[PDB]
Each structure stands twice: as C-alpha cells, then as structure tokens.
Amino acid sequence: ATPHINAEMGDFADVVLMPGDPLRAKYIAETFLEDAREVNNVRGMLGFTGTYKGRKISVMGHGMGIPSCSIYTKELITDFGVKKIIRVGSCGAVLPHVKLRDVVIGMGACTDSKVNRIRFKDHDFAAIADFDMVRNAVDAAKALGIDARVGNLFSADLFYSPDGEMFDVMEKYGILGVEMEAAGIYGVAAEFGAKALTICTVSDHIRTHEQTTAAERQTTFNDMIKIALESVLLGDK
Amino acid sequence: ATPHINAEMGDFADVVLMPGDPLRAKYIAETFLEDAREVNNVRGMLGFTGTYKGRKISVMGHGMGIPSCSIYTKELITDFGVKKIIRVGSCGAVLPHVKLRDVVIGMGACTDSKVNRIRFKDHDFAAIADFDMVRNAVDAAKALGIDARVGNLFSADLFYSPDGEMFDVMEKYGILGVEMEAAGIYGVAAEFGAKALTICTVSDHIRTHEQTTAAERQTTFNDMIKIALESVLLGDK
Amino acid sequence: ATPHINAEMGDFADVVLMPGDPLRAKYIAETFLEDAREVNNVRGMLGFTGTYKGRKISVMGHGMGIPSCSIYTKELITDFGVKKIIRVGSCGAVLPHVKLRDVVIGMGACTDSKVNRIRFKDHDFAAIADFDMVRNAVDAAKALGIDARVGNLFSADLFYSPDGEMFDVMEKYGILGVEMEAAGIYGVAAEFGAKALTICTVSDHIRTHEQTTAAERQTTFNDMIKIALESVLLGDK
Amino acid sequence: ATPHINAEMGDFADVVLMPGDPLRAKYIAETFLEDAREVNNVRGMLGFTGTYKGRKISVMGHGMGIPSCSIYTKELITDFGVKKIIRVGSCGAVLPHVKLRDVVIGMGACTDSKVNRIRFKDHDFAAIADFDMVRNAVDAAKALGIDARVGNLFSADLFYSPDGEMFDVMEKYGILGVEMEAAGIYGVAAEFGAKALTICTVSDHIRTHEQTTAAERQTTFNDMIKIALESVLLGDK
Amino acid sequence: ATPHINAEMGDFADVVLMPGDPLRAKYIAETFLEDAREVNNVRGMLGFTGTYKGRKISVMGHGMGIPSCSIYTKELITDFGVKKIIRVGSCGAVLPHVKLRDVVIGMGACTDSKVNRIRFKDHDFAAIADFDMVRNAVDAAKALGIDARVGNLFSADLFYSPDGEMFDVMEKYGILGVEMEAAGIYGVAAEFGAKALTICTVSDHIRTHEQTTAAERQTTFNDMIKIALESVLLGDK
Amino acid sequence: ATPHINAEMGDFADVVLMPGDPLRAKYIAETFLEDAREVNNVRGMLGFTGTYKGRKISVMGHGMGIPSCSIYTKELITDFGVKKIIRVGSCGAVLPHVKLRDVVIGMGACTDSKVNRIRFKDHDFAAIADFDMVRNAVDAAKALGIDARVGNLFSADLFYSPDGEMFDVMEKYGILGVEMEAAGIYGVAAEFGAKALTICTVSDHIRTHEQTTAAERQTTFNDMIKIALESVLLGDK
Ligand SMILES: Nc1ncnc2c([C@@H]3O[C@H](CO)[C@@H](O)[C@H]3O)n[nH]c12
Ligand SMILES: Nc1ncnc2c([C@@H]3O[C@H](CO)[C@@H](O)[C@H]3O)n[nH]c12
Ligand SMILES: Nc1ncnc2c([C@@H]3O[C@H](CO)[C@@H](O)[C@H]3O)n[nH]c12
Ligand SMILES: Nc1ncnc2c([C@@H]3O[C@H](CO)[C@@H](O)[C@H]3O)n[nH]c12
Ligand SMILES: Nc1ncnc2c([C@@H]3O[C@H](CO)[C@@H](O)[C@H]3O)n[nH]c12
Ligand SMILES: Nc1ncnc2c([C@@H]3O[C@H](CO)[C@@H](O)[C@H]3O)n[nH]c12
C-alpha cells in the first residue's frame, strides 16, 4: 500500500489506463474488461484490474491536474511495478482544422506548470511520450479505421485561465489539444524510468461552434479506449 | 450547473468547507451536519449541504493539487454564490516542534506553482487568507481548547519532490505545513473576489516519516472540522 | 556597534518602530516618547530610545527600499536583541475606495523584488507579518476608534515604475497600498528569526495623483503611530 | 533571395537535409545526389539541389548552434517553400548504454536556450519532430539493418557549459544525445508551420571522453545520410 | 519640488556627485566646493550646490540600495535638468589582486536586482556607464597619479547575503567591487536619457585580511572625489 | 588541437580578429596582413596568422550566433593563448540618429540569450568589453577621421524575433546596434580571463529596412578592419 493507493503489489497490471474521472475508470473496466475487480478506492480514486482479450489490464482515475496525476503515476511505477501508463482523456481544441471528436495522440506535451523546470534545472525539458507506445496507438487506430492526429498537447494548470491570450499562442505553435495532465505524466515517466502516452478526444473547441451528438461523442470516446487497449496488444508483440 | 458541479444556484451554502478527499467531505456531512443532502456527484467529488447549529453549511471535496482545487473553488464562487471557502486538510510537517495531529492555520501560503506568477505578471503575490477568517479560526480553537499555530503553509505541486533540500529551506523559513492547495485557493479567492482560509491537520512528518493511514486521513481529523465550523458562527456575528 | 548602527547592546528596546524617514523617527521620539535619547546618527539614520506609558520603545528610520531597510532590520535583530519590528509609513493607494490618510495593515506583502526568490530557491515566499502583531494592531486601532484595513501591501523596487499596467493588476488583486519595504522586512524577520509588522498611512493616490507634502509625510501621521505604540502594549499582556 | 541565401523560389526542393559542418553539403551532393546543381554560396554555406532515386532533394549546412540554424531554417520555410527539414549531425552521449556510432533520432529536444520561452510566453514548449518523419527514419534505419534509438536530444547553447552537473540530470531524464540545434529547428518548424527531424550519430561520450576514428566516422556518416534519404522516400509513400 | 527633493529648478548644477551617505554629501561640499549652499534636506537626504574651480557642481546623498538611489537620480534628471550623475561610493573587493583603497571605475554593473529585467522585457540589459564619463575619470586619475581599475561592479540588493556562494562567482567573472547602486543608477540613466558613472574605493575585502590606516583610507576617498570633480572639468571641454 | 580548430599552441597570435562571415578571414589576411599563413581549415572556418606593421595578428571567422562564437573564442583563449579578441561585423540600427555605415563600438552588450544567466547564477551579468580596447578603437577611428559611437549592442538569439515590440524597448534604452554575438564573446572573455571587443558597422535599419550597396559596403568594411588593426597597435602602446 501507498499513501494514496490501498492495494498490494501485483494488484495492478503492468499497464494502466487512466482517465481523469474515477467514475470513468469504473465505466472503462465494466465496458471493456472481463472479470474486472476494484483494487483501489482511497479518496474515491477507483482503480480496477481485469483482462482485455486475455491480457491483464488495469484502469484507474488520475484526478484533474499535474499535481494529482503525478502522485498516482509515481506510486504506480515505483510501488506497483507498472511499466506503462496510458492516459485516456478529453481535451479542448484551438486549431480550426481539429474538430470535435478528433482523436489526438500527444507525442509531446507543452505546459505552463513549473514541475519539469524544477526537475530539469530550470531548462526546457521536452515532455514526450514513449515512441513505441505512440507508434502502437497510431497502428491500432489505423486497424480500427479511426483517424488520429499526432502532435503536441498543452497541459494547463488553470482550466480557467486569467490570460486567454495564451490560446492564440497555442494555435500559432500548432498545439492539437489543451488538457491538464500529459506533461506531468511524461515528467514522472522520465523521472522514474517508465513509459507513458496520452491520448485524448476533443470534447470542446476553446474558440468556436461545432455540433455533434452524445451518441457520437460517446462512440468516439470508446474508440479512444479501443485504441489504447489494442495498442497494448501490439506493444506486447 | 457548472462544468464540474451538477448543482443549481442555491444548492450550496455561502460557506463551503473543502477537504481534498471527497470521502472526508462525506464523513464531515454525516458526522457534523444535520439534514445533509448530497448536491454533487460529478467525478465522485462529493458535495453536501446541511446545517450546523442552525447555520447552513456545505462541504465538498476539492481533489489534490492547485489545478484541481482551482476548478472547484472558481465554480463555487462564480456560479453558486459562495463567499467563503474553508479548506480543511492535511499537511506534512518540517519543523521539529510540530507534531502529528497539530492544527495549523495558514495565514499565508508559499508555493512552487506558477499559477500566481501567471496572475501577477511574474512578480511575488503573497497568497494570504482573509484576516477575519483567520481570527475566527484562532478564536474558535481557543474556545474549544485546541492548540493551533498560525503562519505559512507551503503548497507543493509535487508530493514526490525531487528537491529534498527545499525542505531545509522551508524549515529555515518556518513553514508550518506542506500541503498542495492553499496558495491556489488564495489565488482564486483574490482573482474571483471571495474569501478563503486553509486549516490543516499535520498527518505526517516529512523528516521522521511518521504518519497516519488513509482511513485516518478521512475519518479522524475532528478538531480541525470543529474549529472550521465554529469559526463560521463567529464570522456570522 | 554594527556596520550601520553606532550603538551598543541594550541601547535599543526589544521593539523598534521604523518609518522610512529618519526625520519622522525624530518626530515620533519627540512627540510620543518620554525621556527619549538619540542612540544612532550614522548616515543620518536617526534612532531613539525612550518609553511609552512606561514601556521601553525605540524608533529609527530604515531608509527607502528593501535593500536599505534589510540592512537596518538585520542589524537590529542579530546584534541589538530586537524581537519585533513595526514599520510605520506611507503608501500609495490603487483601490478607488481607499482614501488619503487611511490606515492599512499589511498582513502580507507582495513584491517585485528578487530578494525573497533568492532566499526561497526561486519559489514564491508569502511575505507575511506576525499574526499576533497584526491582531494587536487591529485591536489597538479599534480601541482608538481608528478605521484600519488588513490585507496585502505591494513592496515596489521602483517608485517610478515603467510598468504602469501593473497597477491594474495590483488593483485587481486587492492590494491596499504600494510602498517599498514590507516584503523585505518580512523576509528579514523570517530569515533572522524575529517578528515584524508593517502599518502604512495612505499618503498619495496612484490614480488620482492627490497627495500629501513631504512635511506632512514627516510630522502629521499620528493615528498610525498611536496604533503602533498601543499595539505593543497589547502584545506585552 | 533572402538575407542569408542568394537563391530564388523553386531553387530548393521541398525537402532539405542540413549538416552542421558546411563542407558536408558538397559531400552529400556528390556522393548521394544525381545531377546536383549549386543553388547557394552566401557566406560559404554551399547549398545544392539534386535527386535521390528520382526524388528532388536539397542539402545545405546550417552552422553551429540554435541561432544559426534558426536563420537558415526560417528562410527556407518562409521564402523557399521548404516543407521538411532533416538535420543530420553528431551528438555526445551521457547514457552508459548509448555508444559511439549509435544512431539517435530526436523525437523531442530539450534545451537550455531561451528561444522557445521567448516564443511561448515563458512557458514550456515541447520542441518536437514531426511524428511521421520520425517513424520514416526508424523504418528506413531498420531496412538498412541499423537499430536507431528514439527519444530526447538536449540542444545546448554552450558546448563548453560551466554547469558540469547538468550532464547527470540529462542522464537521469534519459537524454539520448547532446547537440546544439534540434530544439531551435523544431521551434522554427512549429512557428512557421513546417516539419522537421534531427538525426544524430553519437560521436563522443560526454564522460568517457573517447572516440572515434575518421573512417568509422565516415562510414557512420554515410549510414545516417542513407537513413535520412530513404526516410524521405518512405514519407512520400 | 518633487516628492523627495524640496528644491526648485536651477538649484542643482547639471552634474551631481552622489555618495550613499548624506553626511558624506555635506563632507564633500564643505571640503571641495566653494560657496556651497544646502538645497535639499527632505528625509535628511542632504544636497548641496557650490562651485569647483569656478564650475557649478552639486552633491547629494542617494541612500543605500537600488530603490533608494533610483528615486533621487530619476527626479534629478527629469525635474532638475541634471545631465550627469557621478556616484562616489565604497565597495567590497572579491579579487585577490584588488586591494583596500584601490579606485574602481564601474564601466558596467552586474546586479541581482530585478529592476532592469522589469525595464528590459526580462532580457539582459548591460547596465553601463557613459563612455565619455569613464574616459574623463580615467584621464583625471592619470593626471593625479592615481591608479584606477575599469571593469564591472556588482550591485547587490542584500548587503547581508543569505547566499555567500555568489562571491566565488563574482570573482570568477572578474567583478572589481561589490556595492549596491551602480546598476540601478545606470538603468535610470538609460531609461531617462542621461549619463552616469560610478566610482568606488575599496573599503573592505569580502574575503581576506589587509591592513591600512584611517588617514590613508580618507586620503584615497578624497582622491576619488578629486577624480570625479576633475573628470567633470575634462568633459566640459 | 581542439575540437573545432586543428592547430597547435603558437599558431595563433595573441590577438585575433573575427568576422561573422568566414569568407572574410581570407580577405582580411590577403588585404591587410603580410606574410600570412593558413593555420586552420576545420569545417571551412579558415584561420590565418600574419603581421600588420610588424605586429603578429590572426584572423578567423566565428560563425553566426552566440553558441558558435562561444566555441571558437573559448578554444582560442584556453588552448591557443589568445589574450584579445576583436569581433568585426555588422549590425542593424534601431535609433533614428544612427545611420547606415556608422561605426559602433560595443562597450556593453545586452542579450536575450540565457548563456550569461547560466554562468552568473540567474542574475544580471553586465557583458562588457575591455575598456582599453574600447578606447583604442575610439582613438584609432578618430585618427582615421571616423567618428565612432560607443554604447550598448543587443546580441539577439533570433535574427527573426517573434517579438516586434522589443525593438522599441531597445531604442528606448539607447541600443546602438543589433547583432548576434557580442554578449556571448564578452561572457566567454570574462569566464576565461581574457579581453574582448566588438566593433560593428551599421548594415541595416531595423525599421526603415533600407540599404546598402556592396561597394559602399566594402569600403566601410575596410574602414572597420583598419580601425580594429590600428586599435591593436595603440593597445601595444
Ligand atoms: N478545454 C480544456 N482545458 C483543460 N482541460 C480540459 C479537459 C480535461 O478534463 C479535465 C478538466 O475538465 C482535465 O482532466 C483535462 O485533462 N477537457 N477539456 C479541457
Ligand atoms: N507531506 C505532504 N506533502 C504534500 N501534501 C500533503 C498533504 C495533503 O494531502 C494531499 C496529498 O496526500 C494533498 O491534498 C495535500 O494538500 N498531506 N501531507 C502532505
Ligand atoms: N506611491 C508610492 N509608491 C511607492 N512607495 C511609496 C511610499 C513609501 O514612501 C517612500 C517613497 O516615497 C518609500 O519608503 C515607500 O515605502 N509612499 N507612497 C508610495
Ligand atoms: N558533445 C556535444 N555537445 C554539443 N554539440 C555537439 C555536436 C554537434 O557538433 C557541433 C559542435 O561541435 C554542433 O553542431 C552540435 O550539434 N557533436 N557533439 C556534441
Ligand atoms: N561589501 C559591500 N557590499 C555591499 N555594499 C557595499 C558598500 C556601499 O556601502 C553601502 C552599504 O554599506 C552601500 O551604499 C554600498 O554601495 N561598501 N562595501 C560594500
Ligand atoms: N539586424 C541584424 N540582426 C541580427 N544580426 C545582424 C548582423 C550580423 O550578421 C549576422 C546575421 O545576419 C550575425 O553574425 C549578426 O551579428 N547584421 N545585421 C543584423
């Protein structure tokens, strides 16, 4: 057990999918895994372990923001033998050509957090995913006939930015989606010698009016989960 | 409703107690409030409203870290008429004389987050509690015969900090507790025009490594809750 | 003697009032203290010791700016047994409702100086007053029937700031007065293990350009001095 | 023509290989390209355009360091229609398992330069390559029987850094190679909406301080160029 | 009149010598000027105007530190027609070959203050003297047979540095003297279009044991004043 | 030999002129030096050593930007006994009174590079020339009937800066010319205990965007080289 996870070694698979919402973790386990059992409930941050096509898989919420997800990913890696984290989240779009429901794979993650500067002697650490995990996700998406854009996410500390001006900058520099965790998770993975990937679906456009349905949004969210799970099978190789 | 809170104007009292742990919010509502009703379940971030000695009061979790609590506190203030936030949590001590279960009142909160620099043109914003709220908590503690220290907290972005030597600096500058939220809540209070206070119970010692269990950091921090609730009554008069 | 103070241990009371203007220190000693003797003349930074209602008290100028007051406050603390510093000056208001001659009590002090970053590993140190001293000043003011606001000061390095737009940010974050010393004194107090408080009288309005003369900012700020002196008596009990 | 390139729109292919040693351009043109013509000679920075297996390719040196390569890459993109830049150089290794002559592909590039902070409002821009270009290079290398490592480079402003300890930090965070340009080229690519990749051969160990032959050096350089050129063909499909 | 100077236009010469100590200003006026009259006494910051060899000259203390001297130099320049400021101060040595009583001319001034970054969009402003003033001082020193070293000063915000480690850095980079004002004065001169120079005599060695007499120190201080005054005559040309 | 210079101790004179355009080295050697011999050719950065009026002088290009020139200048100083470096280039003017073909002498160099902050513990290092070298150049120019302006250069990392507004700030603070190397060379000179000077001819107006001929360009270049060479002779006495 750790301060934030009341589970024992072996309770987690060596791969963990992580949405921000713990209720979403339960959703994923019930929807996609067989024989899933709850393995954590401390602070309501539900975690589960089951199988996907015979492969042992865990899923657990990471909460909102770099500081929250940094706690859980660190403990999973150092205390629970976890080798890969796949964050499966939502993000906001800033580019006109990135649409609601687009699947976005964060090969890198920009941030306005100070956590990586603290790690990296106040220089610029390029917070990046594991290349093979990125490749596995791209390939799984292709096999599923799902379009996926690979590029930079922006991990924001403030969902409610006092700025606003930063959005034009993100767009100019080609950021695919704004979320709150990827850069933190990538920093943890680098710090502790594990591998991580963030995939998101665009749930909002931080600057426009697009129309979709709940059934379609939920379908795409599930496609993201299928991509993540299938990407694991490809990596297992 | 707001993006992270499924409730309507009036569902919350104008004062909200907020532990980081939504399960602690549940404990508080069951233990200290009368006629408590659950008013939010989104993301499992439980929130309740009831009365304490006839005074309407809410309690809701804020999650771990500045980015998480910044979302909830902002939404409460801008959309739910909330005027005062009292954070009630846990912190780790760095001073030798500070002991487990000690109550600390954060008149100020240091931080290694960038959020206040982003608000304050990269200068030093002194993240401070509302003075009357501090005095109210001090007086309530005195009436309850509970010892409480008033001074600076340190709101860390990384629970697992790579910079161990920073604790020596915190100790040197007399930091009473290390937690992860106060500076962000104080920043939100100033930005959105409300008032806030953080009270913490020392749950672990960063030097001695002595600590309390998760179950204890959920259902046994009663002194702090009593001080918080009684301080509201003082504030009303 | 210390490098900037030609006096000996015991020449100063354990509490020192410090205006920025050494001529104001002279005024205070002549007006409010009994049996005042001059104890320092170095650099014309006049310092006196006498009694107020039988209580031994000193008053000495600290000069303008963080670097100046940091010298004097450090030397008093490390070599003259001084336990409490009460800065008594002047500030400019940015809030519309704050008026000339208003008394403000700086529970916190924001700053654009680098001195606290240099102390605090480039993180945000919340430069805060001693809580008991704040409460003492509030109570003394109430007993004197003098209105006083408690909150953040902003300690500027440049009286003539090239960044006019920063005043809008100060106003936005509810800064009560702009002065040039509090954050530095609070930093010294924490570094060298003493206690401090800054009380200011609003001497000018940064927006309206209304202001008081030099002669007025030397010999007519009596409310603040009375509050300061009476707050010491409260602290003793 | 542009300030540093005396050529006209159309003189460059849409893909440009760029070595850091300007003498390498003529070498690549003569050894790998057919029907090459000279298209720039300003400041001795020879540029050539030719074909590789029918496909139009240009090659021109970029000079050492971020500021030099930022000039040439910007001009190529904005004034010469260049869509893809492949930097082909040399790097020093800090990781024990990374050895001389290893091929490294910079999916990301860390840096101690300020250029991306200047671009990105002082936040962390994750300077990244184009994913497809990265995968093309990985695949091209594999087809050539060369195993390539993919991860972060570190783009240093000072070849002679006074900060010895930074190398240990780079090692801790899994930096594959130290060079001086990638983060700058990636910043320009994002700023001006093009695609870039840096491929490096390990020429030295930062610690071990060994190496490296000139023949083995020439063979490995040829391998890198072949990888780069074949990667373009894969990119075309 | 200005907020810190109770004098009228024309009361100051177009050149002002400025020691930090207002009593030293009086010393200089009485010792070196004919018919000197006091023209400011606000806050005890004595200023005088008289003649040196028929040339109109003013001298006035600037107080300790960048924020203090920035006020006075700004007002002198914008409100009193002052064209040149010559700071005449003391400094501490860090280099083994710089000796007590050496005369140091600050062609540049390093600093740990944030004031120039605030002016200069957070980049590095090289705080420099006016070249002709430097040349005039060098020439006047030569005519007087006085040795003078020209190089960098370091203007510190904290006379009592918590660091200490910064002194080895200053020495490595060849800093000639540590004082507290030059960089601030040079920033003001640049901001407001005037000319400035700092000359110091080494009054202490921040790291050694040297022996001199009071008569010798006072002699050298006067030599610095002669250099400053004679340099003015040379500039008048 | 060093990593970037294939030569041995003694191959370079103690004084080296360095243009930014490498083709200029052979030009200077053939046009101004007698009995010149080639001493470096690595990476095409030709270096020559010869005499000017009997005095040994070397000349070698430095490449564009701080990182490139920092490599060559460091190696020259630490491994080739070089005592003085004179950079001879080109700069853009932002001041209206500074015109094309004007000679500018950088007594100081501002910068947006991070290299000196990295050297100087994140404080402001005033990157300065050697005073005697500055005065020699001023005197050499005057003897040639050329009026030279002495003041600050600005050494930019990005020739193509996304920050348009910085040019107005440079103008406000009296920057004489914008180039890309001086602050870096001055930083290296201070780090390794040598002496440096940058002299530039104004080749463009940043705003006006005019210029500049090639003949008038060649004449002015010759004038700069003559100033540089004659300045060395003055330096020798
Ligand atoms: N426009 C946006 N900005 C920031 N975060 C998010 C998200 C994700 O949802 C959460 C915030 O609602 C957080 O976990 C973040 O990763 N969706 N859309 C977002
Ligand atoms: N030693 C410690 N360091 C940081 N945060 C905390 C806490 C609080 O508990 C949570 C992390 O366990 C988070 O909300 C923080 O504010 N308790 N002990 C802590
Ligand atoms: N508008 C203003 N801005 C900055 N400081 C001050 C002050 C105080 O007075 C001094 C400057 O006049 C200095 O000590 C500062 O703390 N009064 N009004 C001020
Ligand atoms: N250990 C090292 N550090 C920095 N750069 C390099 C290089 C490359 O070589 C050049 C400097 O020698 C520059 O272009 C850089 O990218 N090889 N080995 C390097
Ligand atoms: N070692 C030292 N450090 C900082 N300042 C000074 C001085 C000058 O004296 C004052 C501090 O005593 C201040 O005005 C500064 O410029 N002398 N020696 C110094
Ligand atoms: N407006 C300008 N901006 C930056 N650099 C330069 C130069 C010099 O020319 C090179 C860039 O063209 C580089 O060496 C720089 O120092 N001339 N005009 C310039």
Domain boundaries, chain C: 1-237
Pairwise CA distance, residues E130 & E153, whole Å:
15
E118: CB partners within 8 A, 6+ apart: C112, C157, C158, C161, C162, C163
Pairwise CA distance, residues F108 & F110, whole Å:
7
- Yes or no: say if B50 and B35 are a contact pair by the CB < 8 Å rule: yes
> Pairing mode, if any, of strands E55-60 and E15-18?
parallel
Pairwise CA distance, residues F196 & E151, whole Å:
12
Pairwise CA distance, residues B215 & B218, whole Å:
5
Q: List the one residue out of E106, E167, E169, E112 whose CA is nearest residue F190.
A: E169
The neighbouring-strand residues paired with E85 are E16, E196
Pairwise CA distance, residues E25 & E85, whole Å:
13
Query: What angle (nearest 5°) sits at the alpha carbon of residue F234, between those of residues F231 and F236?
Result: 115
Amino acid making up residue E98: V
Pairwise CA distance, residues A120 & A36, whole Å:
39
Whether A93 lines ligand 1, by a CB cut-off of 6 Å, is: no
Question: Number of C-alpha atoms within 13 angstroms, CB side, residue D50?
Answer: 22
Amino acid making up residue F89: G
Residue C196 token pair: 């401090």
- Yes or no: say if C54 and C143 are a contact pair by the CB < 8 Å rule: no
Residue A131 token pair: 């290349």
Chain C residues with CB under 8 Å of E6 CB are 214
- Examine the residue annotation and report whether F204 is marked as an active-site residue of this protein: yes
The DSSP output letter for B11 is S
Pairwise CA distance, residues B188 & B18, whole Å:
14
Q: List the one residue out of F141, F115, F145 whose CA is nearest residue F127.
A: F115
Q: Supply the residue whose CA is at minimum distance from atom 6 of ligand 1.
A: A179
- Residue C205 CA: distances (Å) to CA of C140, C176, D18, D200, E71: 26, 11, 59, 61, 18
Residue whose entry in the numeric block shows the structure tokens 């590993």: C121
CA dihedral D13, D16, D21, D27 (to 10 degrees): -50
Other C-beta atoms closer than 10 Å to the C-beta of A145 total 7
Which of A46, A65, A115 is opposite residue B68, by nearest beta carbon? A65
Pairwise CA distance, residues E214 & C59, whole Å:
31
Chain C residues with CB under 8 Å of B123 CB are 110-112, 166
> Pairing mode, if any, of strands F177-179 and E34-40?
unpaired
Alpha-helical (H) ranges within chain E are: 22-32, 66-79, 115-119, 131-143, 166-172, 182-192, 214-236
Pairwise CA distance, residues B157 & F198, whole Å:
45
Q: List the one residue out of B85, B92, B95 whose CA is nearest residue B184.
A: B85
C49: CB partners within 8 A, 6+ apart: C11, C12, C13, C33, C36, C37, C39, C56, C57, C58
Pairwise CA distance, residues E58 & E28, whole Å:
10
Pairwise CA distance, residues F168 & E7, whole Å:
34
- Yes or no: say if A125 and D155 are a contact pair by the CB < 8 Å rule: no
Other C-beta atoms closer than 10 Å to the C-beta of F151 total 21
Pairwise CA distance, residues E69 & E63, whole Å:
6
Q: Which residue of B has its CA nearest to C170?
A: B120
Pairwise CA distance, residues E129 & E109, whole Å:
8
- Yes or no: say if E25 and E48 are a contact pair by the CB < 8 Å rule: yes
- The DSSP-derived string for C94-118 is -STT--TT-EEEEEEEEES-SHHHH
Pairwise CA distance, residues F181 & F154, whole Å:
9
Whether A63 lines ligand 1, by a CB cut-off of 6 Å, is: no
Pairwise CA distance, residues D148 & D229, whole Å:
15
End-to-end Cα distance, chain F: 32
Residue whose entry in the numeric block shows the structure tokens 């000695």: B53
- Residue A18 CA: distances (Å) to CA of B25, B77, E113: 24, 29, 45
Pairwise CA distance, residues F219 & F237, whole Å:
27
Q: Is the peptide bond before F198 cis (omega within 30 degrees of 0)?
A: no
Pairwise CA distance, residues A41 & B44, whole Å:
11
Chain A interface with B: residues with Cβ < 8 Å: 3-4, 6, 20-23, 42-46, 61, 63-68, 70-71, 74, 112-115, 118-119, 156-160, 162-163, 180, 191
> Pairing mode, if any, of strands C148-155 and C177-179?
parallel
CATH superfamily of A1-237: Nucleoside phosphorylase domain (3.40.50.1580)
Q: Is residue E181 marked as binding?
A: yes
Other C-beta atoms closer than 10 Å to the C-beta of F8 total 12
D64: CB partners within 8 A, 6+ apart: D20, D159, D180, D181, F63, F65, F67, F68, F71
- Yes or no: say if C196 and C16 are a contact pair by the CB < 8 Å rule: no
Residue whose entry in the numeric block shows the structure tokens 């996700």: A137
- The DSSP-derived string for D166-210 is HHHHHHHTT--EEESSHHHHHHHHHHHT-EEEEEEEEEEETTT--
- The DSSP-derived string for B70-124 is HHHHHHHHHHS---EEEEEEEEEE-STT--TT-EEEEEEEEES-SHHHHHTTTSB
- Residue B149 CA: distances (Å) to CA of B134, B201, C231, D85: 11, 11, 20, 60
CA dihedral F61, F63, F69, F71 (to 10 degrees): -90
- In Å, how far is B11's CA from the nearest CA of chain A? 22
Residue E64 token pair: 């300790």
Other C-beta atoms closer than 10 Å to the C-beta of F96 total 10
> Pairing mode, if any, of strands D34-40 and D103-111?
unpaired
B232: CB partners within 8 A, 6+ apart: B15, B52, B55, B57, B84, B86, B136
Pairwise CA distance, residues F24 & F62, whole Å:
11
Q: Is residue E179 marked as binding?
A: yes
Helix (H) or strand (E) holding C200: strand C195-205
Alpha-helical (H) ranges within C62-212 are: 66-79, 115-119, 131-144, 166-172, 182-192
- Yes or no: say if A128 and D128 are a contact pair by the CB < 8 Å rule: yes
Pairwise CA distance, residues C153 & C146, whole Å:
19
Amino acid making up residue C54: G
Which ligand is the nearest neighbour of the Cα of A62?
1
Pairwise CA distance, residues F213 & F202, whole Å:
12
- The DSSP-derived string for B35-60 is EEEEEE-GGG--EEEEEETTEEEEEE
Resolution of the entry in angstroms: 1.9
Q: Which residue of A has its CA nearest to D116?
A: A124
Pairwise CA distance, residues B177 & A4, whole Å:
19
**Number of residues that make up chain C:** 237
What is the phi/psi pair of residue F87, to 5°?
-80, 135
The neighbouring-strand residues paired with B103 are B148, B201
Pairwise CA distance, residues B16 & B86, whole Å:
6
Amino acid making up residue E216: E
Q: Supply the residue whose CA is at minimum distance from atom 2 of ligand 1.
A: A92
CA B190 from chain centre, in angstroms, equals 15
Q: Counting runs of H as helices and runs of E as strands, what totals does chain F give?
A: 7, 9
Select which of E21, E79, E157, E204 is catalytic.
E204
What is the phi/psi pair of residue D180, to 5°?
-135, 10
- Yes or no: say if F109 and F152 are a contact pair by the CB < 8 Å rule: yes
Q: List the one residue out of B170, B156, B183, B12 whose CA is nearest residue B81.
A: B12
Pairwise CA distance, residues C180 & C131, whole Å:
21
Helix (H) or strand (E) holding E38: strand E34-40
Pairwise CA distance, residues B22 & B37, whole Å:
14
CA C59 from chain centre, in angstroms, equals 11
- Residue D115 CA: distances (Å) to CA of A128, E65, E118, F72, F145: 19, 33, 19, 22, 40
Pairwise CA distance, residues F20 & F28, whole Å:
12
Helix (H) or strand (E) holding F50: strand F47-52
> Pairing mode, if any, of strands D103-111 and D47-52?
unpaired
Axis-axis angle for helices A22-32, A214-236 (nearest 10): 70
- Yes or no: say if B126 and A82 are a contact pair by the CB < 8 Å rule: no
Pairwise CA distance, residues D109 & D153, whole Å:
5
- Yes or no: say if F22 and D61 are a contact pair by the CB < 8 Å rule: no
E66–C43 C-beta distance less than 8 A:
no
Which method was used? X-ray
C-alpha D165 – ligand 4 centre gap (Å): 18
Instruction: Determine the 3-state secondary structure of A53 from DSSP.
Output: coil
- Yes or no: say if C86 and C18 are a contact pair by the CB < 8 Å rule: yes
With touching defined as 3+ CB pairs under 8 A, do chains D and C touch?
A: no
Q: List the one residue out of F51, F48, F156 whose CA is nearest residue F110.
A: F156
Which of D118, D157, D160 is opposite residue F66, by nearest beta carbon? D157
Pairwise CA distance, residues A170 & A177, whole Å:
9
Select which of D79, D132, D139, D204 is catalytic.
D204
- Residue A205 CA: distances (Å) to CA of A220, B6, B70: 16, 21, 21
- In Å, how far is B16's CA from the nearest CA of chain A? 19
Other C-beta atoms closer than 10 Å to the C-beta of A157 total 27
CA dihedral A155, A160, A165, A166 (to 10 degrees): 0
